[PDB]
Design a protein around this ligand. Structure first.
Ligand SMILES: O=C(O)CNC(=O)C(=O)O
Ligand SMILES: [Mn+2]
Lengths: 429, 18
């Protein structure tokens, strides 16, 4: 189907096929040399150049080398620079260039490639969509939103554009607006629409508006393998980890950590209160659109397994106490933070991103009534000097209807069934 | 932009290279 050979390349199709044949047989090593020989002999051959690139691409896979993949990325560029490049080959080469640029985290570089691809093929809808993903990956939702608006003005039925537009709308707290786009988008069945993200956020948007159809979409996302279960909807998981909403200290195995938190809870409280009184700016409002209403702020000591040096100068004793417990300080998919919530606060039902952590809550200042947390089908209360443990990858919900502030200390730990090597290798969240 | 308590971001991880 795809025509990759220009006039001259057709005259050397035998040599080109011979070299490509070696690459398919996994003998990538002598295929590199075969294509490099063709590139020397025919320095303007787009197909020979593409072969060199693909081989460099496979060699990067084998050797796991960023440097050679960087080379492949340049060779894919080289293909586009040669004269008389067939349209199919030009598109393929630059698409792969972008893909690999994103893999390396050269998201800015990827963007320029995607912009070029759209400039070269102004009627290709899929490339406009890919450009939209490029903007999303760098955090540029404004430019992403424009791209999908542009796509949808020409192609209103494009499901990919709809789910992504819906995703952006929901991120912007345009809940009601987002639902039909997410729904129609997933329902389109277009490639790239069957993604856990869109099931996750469609049901959540529906929950927030009181649409009881929400769990029907959670059930479907589960059925399609996006969620471990209807209750546990995290999307960055290690499959198989013991899954339950509430944990006892003994069940976690982190009994020494719990002992330390509970024995020393007042020093932790006191440093938190001191920061509230003398440096309240260190508490940052919750910024993930999880509140229906009210005031909720957090003062973070560790995130992604990295100590915040300045923050720990505000709670030096607490940070010193925690240094002894790598199960939390080294939890690169969790945090250590104070969490203050005031009356008139309701946190929407929500889910954390990963099943690889468990979340400890130490009560520091807990009004006698008004404060509670639901995880799955069970609601519990905090106690001063006492640790609660739950898996926040399960849907949970929080209320604060007391007559004064509620302060807790949040300590995330690796899921105990995670091996030392998994703890070492899992990318940070 | 990080995923701390939720899944608000398009991607929650950020990898660079092999
Ligand atoms: O800090 C609070 O009051 C609410 N906490 C959570 O929802 C959580 O720990 O994941
Ligand atoms: Mn939470």
């Amino acid at each position: 189907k795809p025509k990759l050979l220009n006039k001259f390349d057709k005259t050397i199709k035998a040599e080109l096929d011979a070299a490509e044949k070696l690459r398919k047989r996994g003998k990538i090593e002598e295929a590199v040399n075969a294509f490099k020989e063709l590139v020397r002999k025919y320095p303007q051959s787009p197909r020979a150049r593409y072969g060199k690139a693909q081989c460099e691409d496979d060699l990067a896979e084998k050797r796991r080398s960023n440097e050679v993949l960087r080379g492949a990325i340049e060779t894919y560029q080289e293909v586009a620079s040669l004269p008389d490049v067939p349209a199919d080959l030009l598109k393929l080469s630059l698409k792969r260039r972008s893909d690999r640029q994103q893999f390396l985290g050269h998201m800015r570089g990827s963007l320029l490639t995607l912009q070029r691809l759209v400039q070269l093929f102004p009627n290709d809808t899929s490339l406009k969509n890919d450009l939209g993903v490029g903007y999303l990956l760098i955090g540029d939702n404004d430019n992403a939103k424009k791209v999908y608006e542009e796509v949808l003005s020409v192609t209103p039925n494009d499901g990919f554009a709809k789910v992504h537009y819906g995703f952006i709308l929901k991120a912007q707290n345009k809940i009601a607006e987002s639902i039909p786009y997410l729904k129609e988008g997933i329902e389109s069945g277009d490639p790239g629409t069957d993604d856990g993200r869109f099931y996750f956020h469609l049901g959540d948007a529906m929950q927030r508006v009181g649409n009881k159809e929400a769990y029907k979409w959670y059930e479907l996302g589960h059925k399609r393998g996006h969620f471990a279960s209807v209750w546990q909807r995290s999307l960055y998981n290690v499959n198989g980890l013991k899954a339950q909403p509430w944990w006892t200290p003994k069940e976690t195995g982190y009994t020494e950590l719990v002992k330390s938190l509970e024995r020393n809870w007042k020093l932790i409280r006191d440093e938190g209160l001191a920061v509230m009184d003398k440096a309240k700016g260190l508490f940052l409002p919750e910024d993930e659109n999880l509140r229906e209403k009210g005031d909720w702020s957090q003062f973070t000591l560790w995130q992604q397994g990295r100590r915040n040096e300045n923050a720990c100068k505000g709670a030096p004793k607490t940070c010193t106490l925690l240094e002894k417990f790598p199960e939390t300080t080294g939890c690169r998919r969790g945090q250590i933070k104070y969490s203050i919530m005031h009356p008139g606060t309701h946190v929407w039902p929500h889910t954390g991103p990963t099943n690889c952590r468990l979340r400890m809550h130490l009560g520091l200042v807990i009004p006698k009534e008004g404060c509670k947390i639901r995880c799955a089908n069970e609601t519990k209360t905090w106690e001063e000097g006492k640790v609660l443990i739950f898996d926040d990858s399960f849907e949970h919900e929080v209320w604060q209807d007391a007559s004064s502030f509620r302060l807790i200390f949040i300590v995330d730990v690796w899921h105990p069934e995670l091996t030392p090597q998994q703890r070492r290798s899992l990318p940070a969240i | 932009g990080k995923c701390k308590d939720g899944l608000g971001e398009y991607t929650c991880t950020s990898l660079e290279g092999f």
